Structures are given as structure tokens and as C-alpha cells.
Write a protein that binds this ligand. Structure first.
Ligand SMILES: [K+]
Ligand SMILES: [K+]
Ligand SMILES: [K+]
Ligand SMILES: [K+]
Ligand SMILES: [K+]
Ligand SMILES: [K+]
Ligand SMILES: [K+]
Ligand SMILES: [K+]
Ligand SMILES: [K+]
Ligand SMILES: [K+]
Ligand SMILES: [K+]
Ligand SMILES: [K+]
Ligand SMILES: [K+]
Ligand SMILES: [K+]
Ligand SMILES: [Mg+2]
Ligand SMILES: [Mg+2]
Ligand SMILES: [Mg+2]
Ligand SMILES: [Mg+2]
Ligand SMILES: [Mg+2]
Ligand SMILES: [Mg+2]
Ligand SMILES: [Mg+2]
Ligand SMILES: [Mg+2]
Ligand SMILES: [Mg+2]
Ligand SMILES: [Mg+2]
Ligand SMILES: [Mg+2]
Ligand SMILES: [Mg+2]
Ligand SMILES: [Mg+2]
Ligand SMILES: [Mg+2]
Ligand SMILES: [Mg+2]
Ligand SMILES: [Mg+2]
Ligand SMILES: [Mg+2]
Ligand SMILES: [Mg+2]
Ligand SMILES: [Mg+2]
Ligand SMILES: [Mg+2]
Ligand SMILES: [Mg+2]
Ligand SMILES: [Mg+2]
Ligand SMILES: [Mg+2]
Ligand SMILES: [Mg+2]
Ligand SMILES: [Mg+2]
Ligand SMILES: [Mg+2]
Ligand SMILES: [Mg+2]
Ligand SMILES: [Mg+2]
Ligand SMILES: [Mg+2]
Ligand SMILES: [Mg+2]
Ligand SMILES: [Mg+2]
Ligand SMILES: [Mg+2]
Ligand SMILES: [Mg+2]
Ligand SMILES: [Mg+2]
Ligand SMILES: [Mg+2]
Ligand SMILES: [Mg+2]
Ligand SMILES: [Mg+2]
Ligand SMILES: [Mg+2]
Ligand SMILES: [Mg+2]
Ligand SMILES: [Mg+2]
Ligand SMILES: [Mg+2]
Ligand SMILES: [Mg+2]
Ligand SMILES: [Mg+2]
Ligand SMILES: [Mg+2]
Ligand SMILES: [Mg+2]
Ligand SMILES: [Mg+2]
Ligand SMILES: [Mg+2]
Ligand SMILES: [Mg+2]
Ligand SMILES: [Mg+2]
Ligand SMILES: [Mg+2]
Lengths: 118, 146, 9, 144, 65
RNA sequence: GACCGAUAGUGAACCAGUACCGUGAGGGAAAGGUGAAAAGCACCCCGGAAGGGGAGUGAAAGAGAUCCUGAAACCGUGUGCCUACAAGUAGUCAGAGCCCGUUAACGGGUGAUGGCGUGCCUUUUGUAGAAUGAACCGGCGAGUUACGAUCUCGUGCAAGGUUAAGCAGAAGAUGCGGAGCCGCAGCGAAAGCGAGUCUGAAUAGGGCGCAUGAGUACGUGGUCGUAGACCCGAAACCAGGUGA
RNA sequence: UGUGGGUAGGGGUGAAAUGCCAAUCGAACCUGGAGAUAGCUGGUUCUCUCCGAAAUAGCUUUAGGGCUAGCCUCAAGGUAA
RNA sequence: UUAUCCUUGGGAGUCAGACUGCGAGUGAUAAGAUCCGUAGUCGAAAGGGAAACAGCCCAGACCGCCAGCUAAGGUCCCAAAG
RNA sequence: GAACAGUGGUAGGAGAGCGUUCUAAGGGCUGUGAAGCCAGACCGGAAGGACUGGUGGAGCGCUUAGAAGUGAGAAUGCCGG
RNA sequence: GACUCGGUGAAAUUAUAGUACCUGUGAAGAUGCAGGUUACCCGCGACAGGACGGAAAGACCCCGUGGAGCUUUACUGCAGC
């Protein structure tokens, strides 16, 4: 029996073009370039799901440093003091206090200062 | 069985491998042939026994011997097979052939001396090994040549 | 249209 | 998730006055770059400008160590052939002291569009006097 | 069509009981002045086809009993 | 008919060996589908007509002949979000603002700005490659089948296993058909001998065998052989013709 | 220079250039042998999982090919070598 | 202490290698040269560092996380941290 | 079911699957609207599979097994636009 | 001719392109990589420095146990004599 190509080809290609919605020009329109861009988008998104974790930790650290230096500590000294005082509140949480509850941040910072002055 | 619930014996049927049907299969593109050279080509490959021009093994070695036109092959029967007959049976080529003890007669029955014969028999055969003749006569029987 | 071509002999 | 992000609505810019007199060009500039970027603020957000405005007064009194006054050249190229032009740091400090500070800081800011926007919050003056009294700027004393 | 036996090989090899291939030795035609008696004594006896060679040639002798 | 269904199947579903090409031998296409029925749109209106808008017919006219369906490329009209200081393999992750409201989901569209980021394929020691291929979209387009061989797996029977042609029978199953084939014994060039045999003067030693037992028929799968043998591609060679 | 004729491809014709023989000439064109052959180049279409090389030796009218070995894999054994 | 190793059989691919370090030859103790030996990496390996940069340094990506500790390399600003 | 270990990969070996046309046997769906086509924010580890609405106007799934003209993005591929 | 208006209206090429410069880097000569430097958005007339621009699977050179034509005290044949 003969098997015509039939409908499988366009069904498969349509799915790629749907994933290419919002791409620029021919990249949302033409299968061969939409397909390359969707593939590339996969490699990027994998890479970027890892980078996202690096990037947020970088951001939190920046904010903790800013809040720390308003209490006369560098980020480095603060983190040393918090570790000595046994405090395991993480950078995401410290940076949240730094923005949202700075009085609480200052208590933690004052706890750190205590251990450093010992 | 039911024609709507047919099921092959487990391990009786496998799916064929289809090469050159995409990268996921592991035989896409080069269809398992690697890259270039004579072995990857359609119709390719050297003939069997060819060693790329080193003198082939068969040609390095000498022809030996000849074939005899008048070569005789006997249907051999060991004593163990005669043990299957009844006691006092006149065992012959025609009986051996009819019972299925031998498939093809060829040049004749020859009796050979492997195994043990308990039963007394009048064995009629074209040839006997010296062992077999002795063993037939030792069991009480007769080893007539025919 | 050249007599020989590019990087001629 | 939950990490707060500053935006145009949330952001509040102070005006600051930094006196350049007697300061080392690069040491002053590195600190000011950080203020224009907003690196001193706990709400620092990398995709918006959280920084403060900075006025620099006494730009012509900026200092340089070593033989830099004679030996630090400011090159530029006009994109015409042979169009490399040069000024020494002394020539810069004498006749273009505002540019001298603006170049140092511009080179210490991020390079694209937001960086270019961050530079617009800087204001550098030759003298001791600035025209931004109406912005009510506070003195900022440079750290280490 | 049926596979054809390689007739050259059939004239030189023989299948043993266990399915090895018996062969003669090379260097047994002439120039016996240049070979020691020990060599000549040993080359006189039959040998077996090597594993590497056997895999190369087994199909060429498939029909031989 | 576990054959094709309009790029398939004949070159040819159709006024096809036609049209067209060539002095000639010769080469050689494209092109199927209104509707159940023509009931194939009276009449009115714009227009020279074409073509439309109504009105009718019809189940349907967005079935009106370029007439079943009607994808994509490509061309337009409208507009929700964005866009005239910006350096861009065009995305991705972060992200306000604005606009929406779903197969109701830690939703959809858009995207100021920030970080990261040199297409795909082929071929290479190494290619973002300033190497190769692809204008785009669509369709078509490459390890097949026959007969042998061999191995694994499965099944039947098992020191046995098995029939071919043929005859009868649905173009069938199946019954009959034992001729033949493989296996149950090997060793030797051979005569031959035989659980041994060959070499050898040898009751020696050594080689190959036995002791140390499984095959065979069929099927699926892997690979090989003979066939174009995974597909496409020369320059050429030969034969018979056609041309001054 | 016209008209009518002649010579035909392992052949014609050539005041000779391998020129010309229907926009084809170091051997015309068409069809067939014919799916010639191509150790060369290109291409070979779904997915995920387990494992995972080589670019070396030897020989080769062999050197960008091949064959055996080495290195990979699957199965069955031996088993702990 | 570790889990390989051998045999038989089925199926391959490979026979253009590259650089780096170390030991030699050839060369001029030239070459990103060439040819061996030896280890590594690339090849067939993404991630971090060396601005960028197959072959160097660190290190082996089954997926997800807006958790944490470290390696090389770093901590004035670009750019995380003195 | 637990524990422990593992899960980069080209050539390539091995395994498990997805989908396509046809056939057989069950069983079904369909003018109260089949296939095809269009759209969507659904589902599955992938290949892929549904559901809803629109168009369409007569055919088509599902289960198990069988058989293959069975999957395309590249061939300066062929044909059409 | 070009240029402007009215009529008519091709082509080679083309992976998709929002398509600067310098120094560097890199398959060793970069619009696209790095670091800098510069640059508002869209055209029209002009010029060819670059896109190793287009065109033609380099004629040179090498390689293929590929051809063809030609030569001769290459080999083996054949006609003729
Ligand atoms: K293979
Ligand atoms: K046709
Ligand atoms: K971006
Ligand atoms: K080129
Ligand atoms: K013996
Ligand atoms: K069996
Ligand atoms: K087979
Ligand atoms: K084949
Ligand atoms: K001539
Ligand atoms: K080395
Ligand atoms: K429908
Ligand atoms: K194509
Ligand atoms: K290159
Ligand atoms: K130009
Ligand atoms: Mg197709
Ligand atoms: Mg396989
Ligand atoms: Mg593979
Ligand atoms: Mg491919
Ligand atoms: Mg290839
Ligand atoms: Mg190969
Ligand atoms: Mg940057
Ligand atoms: Mg002799
Ligand atoms: Mg059909
Ligand atoms: Mg049709
Ligand atoms: Mg047709
Ligand atoms: Mg005519
Ligand atoms: Mg309609
Ligand atoms: Mg109809
Ligand atoms: Mg229609
Ligand atoms: Mg500007
Ligand atoms: Mg703007
Ligand atoms: Mg750049
Ligand atoms: Mg190269
Ligand atoms: Mg090429
Ligand atoms: Mg091209
Ligand atoms: Mg000839
Ligand atoms: Mg004639
Ligand atoms: Mg005439
Ligand atoms: Mg001519
Ligand atoms: Mg032929
Ligand atoms: Mg592994
Ligand atoms: Mg190669
Ligand atoms: Mg070759
Ligand atoms: Mg091998
Ligand atoms: Mg080497
Ligand atoms: Mg080198
Ligand atoms: Mg390679
Ligand atoms: Mg490795
Ligand atoms: Mg790497
Ligand atoms: Mg980097
Ligand atoms: Mg690479
Ligand atoms: Mg910092
Ligand atoms: Mg891993
Ligand atoms: Mg159908
Ligand atoms: Mg196909
Ligand atoms: Mg195409
Ligand atoms: Mg590179
Ligand atoms: Mg360089
Ligand atoms: Mg350069
Ligand atoms: Mg380019
Ligand atoms: Mg060119
Ligand atoms: Mg180009
Ligand atoms: Mg070429
Ligand atoms: Mg020429």
C-alpha cells in the first residue's frame, strides 16, 4: 500500500510556527527559520534558567551591601558576623528585609556587629 | 484464540530497524555507515576474502589432494541403535531403512562398535568394524555380510 | 571572458 | 517570586554636592559613578535608574598623582584619516575641567542606554558655585 | 540464486569435526635448499585457519559439508 | 487484488504520442471535481463592456463556470500594545507600564529598560565562518525485494527433523506425495579404517576427533552473498539508425 | 552567386586552422546496451533511553581505499581469574 | 581496598588528528613546522576563568528552585565581593 | 516497594516507544454533521494526543494483531506557486 | 540615454537580518565576537572601498590503479603487403 505524506507534515510544522509567535518578520512566518529560532530559544532558556539563579543572588548581595553600609558594615563583614552569630537567614531574605523591613535588617546587622567586636 | 485478541509468542517477532529516518533513531543521516570511503557507498565494499591487495590467504596456501570418483560412503550404525530392535530380530538394510534407523542407504550399512549391544540379533550388513562384529557375536548373535 | 582566468597558470 | 523591583513610580532621587577640590580624579569618579547608578540604595534595581543626581563643584581643582598632568593624554579620533587628536591632562584640567571629570565618570558607568540616561544626572562645574539651589542639594562626603 | 562456493578455497581447506578449517602450510613448493630440516618437517604437517582469517572467509565455504 | 487515486497510477482519467521542440531519426508535456437536478441567476440598478449590488433558483450561490474542500508562501485593509539618542544571528531570562480575559491556569497580548547570546546543514585537527548548500512556501524525493548463507530469538518435533515437483482443493487452508535435504562419526590426499583415525618402522609422540549428546523444519530480527542492491551525478565505450 | 545534385562518422571534406560536417567536432546527432562504471563529491526523512570509540600497527600498484589486529557494543558463558 | 577481567558468538565505526606540558630527532636547540615517545585536554565536553579565544587554568550539563558552600580567578567603577 | 549508586557525548552498538496508509477481528462514531481545514490559555518524559468553537458537507475513529511506496530542512535535488 | 511626470514593466541574486567605525580576537584578512569610539527616523541623485560581491562544482596544480586524442625501436593483436 502507498502512504501519501498526508497531514502529518503540516501538523508538525504548524506546531513550531505557533511556538514562534511574536518573533520578528520571517521568524514567525517561515518554517525553516522559525524552527531554527525555536531550537535556539531552547538552548537559551536552559542556559538562562541556570543564569537566573546567579543573577538574583547577585542582586540580593548588592542590596545587602547597600543596607549593610548604612549600618557601617561592608557586605563581607556583615556576612562574617551573621555566620559567627549562627544566623542562617539567606541572601534572598536579608535583601527582602533590606528593602521592606529595614529596622529588622538593622537588628540582624547589630547582631553581626556584636560578634565582630568580640 | 480470537481474531480480535491475537498475540504472538513473546520474543518471536521484533520490529525491523529502518535506517536514515532521522537523528533520534541513532541511524539517521549516514544510516550507520560512518563517513565516506568504499564501505559507505551504494553497492560498496570489497568482495569476500579480499585483503585490499595483500595476497589473499587462500592464494598463499597450496591446493591439497584429490577427490575419488569411486568414493564409497556407508550409512554407519552404532551398536546402541541395534539395541532398539527386538530380541532375535533379523536386522537388515531394508529394515533399518524402513524403521527409520537410517535415512539414506548410500553405499550400504556399516555396523560400528560404539555403545553396547545386549540383545541377540542376526545383523545382515555390507560391512562391520572389527569391534562391532565381535560385539554382535559376543551378545550371541550373528554378523552376516551381505 | 578572460584568456586563462583567475590565478592563471 | 518575591524580590521587589524599583520602578519609575517608586524611585526617589536626592541631589548631592561633591567638592572635587584636592580629590584624586579616579578615586572621586569611581564613587560618583556608583552613586549615579544607585549602588548605595537598598532598592537598587539593575534595569532602572535608582541613582541620585550629583553636582561636582571645583572640577578644575581635581588632583592627579605621578607625572599624569604632563603624561596622561586624552586621545580622540575625528573619523577622518589621520584625525587622531590629543590633549594632555594639564590642558584638559586648565581649559576643559568639566569634560575631564565627565570623561572619567562616563567611562565608569554602564555603556548602553540606561548608562547614558544615568550620566544625565551628573552636573560638573569649574567654579565653587552651581545653579541648582532650587533642587536643595545636600553635601555628600566621599568615603574611602 | 544460491550462494556459490569459492572453488579455490574449497580446493585448499577442509572442515574438521568441531568446525575449524584445516589447511596446509605455505613454503612447501620449492627452494628446499634454503629451509632447514626443522622448518621442512614442521611445514609438512597440517595447520588450522586463524580466528581472524576464519571470520573473513567462513561464508566462502558455507556450502561445504 | 492487506495494487494507484490526479506531482500517484500508463507518457496519456481530459480530443496524447496531441500541443510544443527538432532538417531528421527523435524528444515529448500540461490539463479531473457547479449542483440531486440546470432549477445555469427573469427583472431592476451602476457601467461602453468586464464586473458588481439587489431580486430570483437552490439545502447551500462565500456551490455562479477562473464553479467540492480550499493549507502555506506572497499581497492587502483595520487596529490593542510598542517605536524617531539608537549599534540589533533578532532570541532568551529579568521587568515596569498599558491593553485584555482563558481548555482557570502561581492566565493572554504588547514590551521601556537590564543581563546573556556569532543561524541551520555539510565537511573538518579546527567552521560565526571571509569554506559548502538552501530565495521562500507546498508537494514529491534515498538500506528495498527475491533467492541463498549465517547468527540470535520464538515455536513444533527430537536421535532424529523435514518434504520438492506434482495431484486434489477458493488463485486458499489442508490432505496426499519420502524422490531429495540436513543431522545422528570421525579421521585420511586417497585406498580405507572407524570411537578412533592420520603421520610414522613404532605398543612412541604428535595432529584432528571421541569421551565431555542436538539437531531439524518454519517464522521474526541482525548481517553477509548474487542481483542497479541506500539515492542522485560523469567524462567516456559499443551497436543500430538520422543528418551535406 | 542561384538552382539541381554527390561524398556520412573507426566516415566524409579540408589552398591544412584539427578546420568544417544544421548555433554540437582531437572524432556529429538520435535511440538502445543502460539504472554503464564512479575506492570520488553531495544527499539519506520520527523520538527518548543504555553504553560509547578511532584518527594506531601490519600488509597492500598502497598511501583521502581495503583487509586482519587494536579500541566500541550486544548476548551467552567462565566466574572473581 | 576496588570491580573488573577472560572466553565464545552477533553488530560496528576508525586507519586526515589538533594543541599543551615533559623527553628526543629533523630544522637554525626557527615555525601555530615536522616526526616519534609520554601525560592531558579538544576531537566527541556544555559550565566558571584567561577581554574576545576547540586544544591553557578550574570543572564534567538527567530535569526543576528568586536556597547554601566552594574551585580557578577575583573584591575602586564598568562588574559580584576588601 | 526500599536503600545505595548512576544518568555530557560524534562515529557506532543495544533497547523502548510515537505517528502514517492498508488488511483482519472486536467494538463504535457520523447529515442531531465524517475526513480535511482554521483558532485556542488543555494533556503526556519525547515522538505526539485530546477537548471546544468555526469552516466543511460524507465519510471516519478505537482495540488487538498483520503488512509496508511508513515520517524531510538541506541532494547548485524535481514540479508548481 | 541618465533625471522629473504620465503609460507599460523585466532580470541576475537572495539563510533570516533592527546590516557603523577603530584596535584586537578568531579556521591566522569581521557589519554580526571583545573593548572602546561614533550614530535621531525615512528617502532621492551620485561613487565603487568591502560584503574574500554576482556569474561558471578552478582550465593551473595535485589526486583517481577516471577518460579521450596523439606517438613510438612499450606490450599484444589485426588489415594490408
Ligand atoms: K553500522
Ligand atoms: K505525466
Ligand atoms: K534583551
Ligand atoms: K569558495
Ligand atoms: K592419537
Ligand atoms: K528448536
Ligand atoms: K535471516
Ligand atoms: K543491499
Ligand atoms: K578531418
Ligand atoms: K606531545
Ligand atoms: K470539523
Ligand atoms: K530543496
Ligand atoms: K574559515
Ligand atoms: K562597492
Ligand atoms: Mg513529503
Ligand atoms: Mg541498531
Ligand atoms: Mg550515534
Ligand atoms: Mg540531517
Ligand atoms: Mg556525508
Ligand atoms: Mg568507513
Ligand atoms: Mg557589559
Ligand atoms: Mg612438491
Ligand atoms: Mg490510497
Ligand atoms: Mg486534488
Ligand atoms: Mg499523470
Ligand atoms: Mg516542424
Ligand atoms: Mg464556504
Ligand atoms: Mg458533494
Ligand atoms: Mg473550491
Ligand atoms: Mg547622545
Ligand atoms: Mg526615544
Ligand atoms: Mg560590538
Ligand atoms: Mg583544512
Ligand atoms: Mg565542496
Ligand atoms: Mg547559495
Ligand atoms: Mg574504440
Ligand atoms: Mg543520408
Ligand atoms: Mg541535398
Ligand atoms: Mg557548427
Ligand atoms: Mg550492461
Ligand atoms: Mg558514558
Ligand atoms: Mg576520511
Ligand atoms: Mg582512493
Ligand atoms: Mg576489525
Ligand atoms: Mg600523532
Ligand atoms: Mg603542528
Ligand atoms: Mg571528526
Ligand atoms: Mg573523555
Ligand atoms: Mg569545553
Ligand atoms: Mg567569557
Ligand atoms: Mg565546535
Ligand atoms: Mg561591586
Ligand atoms: Mg553528568
Ligand atoms: Mg483517510
Ligand atoms: Mg517514503
Ligand atoms: Mg523545499
Ligand atoms: Mg571559535
Ligand atoms: Mg590571531
Ligand atoms: Mg581582524
Ligand atoms: Mg558574511
Ligand atoms: Mg566571487
Ligand atoms: Mg557570498
Ligand atoms: Mg572542483
Ligand atoms: Mg583550455
Amino acid at each position: 500500500p502507498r502512504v501519501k505524506g498526508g497531514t502529518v507534515t503540516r501538523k508538525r510544522r504548524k506546531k513550531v510556527l505557533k511556538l514562534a509567535k511574536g518573533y520578528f518578520g520571517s521568524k514567525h512566518t517561515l518554517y525553516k527559520v522559525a524552527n531554527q529560532q525555536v531550537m535556539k530559544s531552547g538552548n537559551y532558556a536552559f542556559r538562562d534558567r541556570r543564569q537566573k539563579k546567579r543573577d538574583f543572588r547577585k542582586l540580593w548581595i548588592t542590596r545587602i551591601n547597600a543596607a549593610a553600609r548604612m549600618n557601617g558594615l561592608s557586605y563581607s563583614r556583615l556576612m562574617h558576623g551573621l555566620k559567627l552569630s549562627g544566623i542562617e537567614v539567606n541572601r534572598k531574605m536579608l535583601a527582602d528585609l533590606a528593602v521592606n523591613d529595614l529596622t529588622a535588617f538593622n537588628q540582624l546587622a547589630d547582631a553581626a556587629k556584636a560578634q565582630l567586636n568580640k | 484464540m480470537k481474531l480480535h485478541e491475537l498475540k504472538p509468542s513473546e520474543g518471536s517477532r521484533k520490529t525491523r530497524n529502518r535506517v536514515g529516518r532521522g537523528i533520534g533513531s541513532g541511524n539517521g543521516k549516514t544510516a550507520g555507515k560512518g563517513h565516506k570511503g568504499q564501505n559507505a557507498r551504494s553497492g560498496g565494499g570489497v568482495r569476500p576474502g579480499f585483503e585490499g591487495g595483500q595476497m589473499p590467504l587462500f592464494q598463499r596456501l597450496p591446493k591439497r589432494g584429490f577427490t575419488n570418483i569411486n568414493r564409497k560412503e556407508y550409512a554407519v550404525v552404532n551398536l546402541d541403535k541395534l539395541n532398539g530392535f527386538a530380541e532375535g530380530t533379523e536386522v537388515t538394510p531394508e529394515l533399518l531403512l524402513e524403521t527409520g534407523v537410517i535415512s539414506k542407504l548410500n553405499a550400504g550399512v556399516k555396523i560400528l562398535g560404539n555403545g553396547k549391544l545386549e540383545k541377540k540379533l542376526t545383523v545382515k550388513a555390507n560391512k562391520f568394524s572389527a569391534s562391532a562384529k565381535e560385539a554382535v557375536e559376543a551378545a550371541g548373535g550373528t554378523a552376516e555380510v551381505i | 571572458r578572460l584568456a586563462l582566468g583567475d590565478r592563471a597558470p | 517570586r518575591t524580590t521587589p523591583m524599583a520602578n519609575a513610580s517608586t524611585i526617589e532621587r536626592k541631589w548631592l554636592v561633591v567638592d572635587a577640590a584636592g580629590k584624586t580624579l579616579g578615586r572621586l569618579s569611581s564613587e560618583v559613578a556608583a552613586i549615579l547608578r544607585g549602588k548605595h540604595k537598598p532598592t537598587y534595581t539593575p534595569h532602572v535608574d535608582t541613582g541620585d543626581h550629583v553636582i561636582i563643584i571645583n572640577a578644575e581643582k581635581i588632583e592627579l598623582t605621578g607625572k599624569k598632568l604632563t603624561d596622561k593624554i586624552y586621545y580622540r579620533h575625528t573619523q577622518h584619516p589621520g584625525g587622531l587628536k590629543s590633549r594632555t591632562a594639564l590642558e584638559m584640567r586648565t581649559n576643559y575641567p568639566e569634560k575631564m571629570l565627565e570623561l572619567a565618570i562616563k567611562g565608569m558607568l554602564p555603556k548602553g542606554s540606561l548608562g547614558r540616561q544615568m550620566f544625565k544626572k551628573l552636573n560638573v562645574y569649574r567654579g565653587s558655585e552651581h545653579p541648582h539651589e532650587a533642587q536643595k542639594p545636600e553635601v555628600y562626603e566621599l568615603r574611602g | 540464486p544460491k550462494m556459490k562456493t569459492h572453488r579455490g578455497s574449497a580446493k585448499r581447506f577442509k572442515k574438521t569435526g568441531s568446525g575449524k578449517l584445516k589447511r596446509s602450510h605455505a613454503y612447501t613448493s620449492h627452494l628446499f635448499a634454503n629451509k632447514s630440516q626443522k622448518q621442512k618437517r614442521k611445514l609438512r604437517k597440517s595447520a588450522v585457519v586463524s580466528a581472524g582469517d576464519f571470520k573473513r572467509i567462513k561464508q566462502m565455504l558455507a556450502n561445504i559439508k
